[PDB]
Design a protein around this ligand. Structure first.
Ligand code: NI
Length: 341
């Protein structure tokens, strides 16, 4: 049964709630972004309206094959009426097509649902700066002070330099990047760029990428593996036994892989900086875990919440245990007492 934190009071609207069957009362199903925990349930047979970004609509149409008439894409940063209720979609700084949604209720209450987000100061000068927000449905993936990670720009810097050095030291070395969903395209697009290559990938992954309205995309990516020296592979496959496997397939065109595993947080964030990272090494194959996050650090979250000064906060992540719930509320109270709202 759909949990209360997926429902928007005083509307027929639900958010990321596609896996419960028909939800009694729901006139409209919003989808914040194309990630499978959020879309779980969708298929060609859905015949209720979906509201989502243009880019999420492309993925629905071409990867799940939902019928064009049930996909209502909306532009960002634009006041739109949906079943007689004003809404705005805002960029979430998560993966391509990912949005937060502003709901202006008839009674005058205002609700922000963040979907998944990496909070950023640029949001403080969006349409959000114009009015008060009473309820906040918040991505709490990393709502605990151990969760620090570097900026995306830092991480991209590290990657570009690592890659560029190896390739210039050994021109028969391959770069591999692991992937399993949309997100984090910047890692492989930045490396490819520095090296003068397109990124090579399977046919399903090329198709996924051709949905994303990335500008100049036909120049950056290809399905021809031989032609390219940055390859994408399934994240499952990014290990020694499966990289060796892949190192064979190329057929003696490269003598050394240098792979990158973009991760979220891992416990070595607690002890080591980005400039002091090292790989695992079994022969000629090296593997960097790099902590490129598309979720708020604790500090980024805390800041955003203290600027917003919401009257109420409803968690959408880590809500399944009383211990996580309790710890979260404790941080919410600290924040509010520090900030005086
Ligand atoms: Ni996500």
């Amino acid at each position: 049964t759909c949990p209360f934190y997926k429902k928007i009071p005083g509307t027929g609207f639900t958010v990321d709630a596609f896996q419960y069957g028909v939800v009694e009362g729901c006139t409209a199903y919003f989808l914040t972004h194309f990630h499978s925990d959020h879309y779980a349930g969708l298929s060609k047979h859905f015949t209720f309206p979906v509201y989502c970004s243009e880019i999420t609509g492309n993925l629905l149409k071409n990867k799940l094959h939902v019928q064009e008439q049930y996909i209502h894409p909306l532009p960002l940063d634009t006041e739109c009426i949906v079943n007689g209720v004003k809404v705005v979609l805002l960029d979430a700084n998560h993966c391509p097509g990912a949005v937060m949604i502003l709901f202006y209720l008839p009674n005058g209450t205002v609700i922000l649902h963040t979907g998944d987000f990496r909070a950023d100061p640029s949001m403080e000068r969006s349409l959000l700066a114009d009015q008060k927000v009473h309820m906040l449905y918040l991505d709490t993936t990393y709502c605990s002070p151990e969760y620090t990670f570097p900026s995306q720009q830092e991480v991209i810097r590290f990657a570009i330099n690592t890659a560029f050095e190896a390739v210039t030291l050994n021109p028969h070395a391959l770069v591999v990047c692991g992937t399993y969903s949309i997100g984090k395209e910047k890692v492989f697009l930045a490396i490819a760029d520095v090296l003068g290559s397109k990124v090579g990938m399977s046919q399903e992954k090329y198709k996924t990428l051709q949905c994303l309205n990335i500008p100049e995309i036909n120049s950056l990516i290809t399905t021809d593996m031989c032609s390219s020296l940055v390859h994408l592979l399934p994240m499952m496959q990014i290990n020694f036994k499966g990289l060796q496997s892949h190192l064979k397939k190329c057929g003696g065109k490269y003598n050394q892989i240098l792979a990158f595993r973009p991760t979220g947080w891992t416990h070595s964030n607690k002890f080591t900086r980005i400039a002091d990272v090292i790989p695992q090494t079994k022969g000629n194959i090296s593997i960097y875990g790099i902590p490129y996050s598309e979720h708020s650090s604790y500090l980024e979250m805390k800041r955003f919440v203290q600027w917003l000064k919401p009257q109420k906060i409803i968690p959408t992540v880590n809500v399944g245990t009383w211990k996580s719930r309790s710890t979260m509320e404790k941080y919410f109270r600290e924040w509010k007492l520090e900030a005086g709202y």
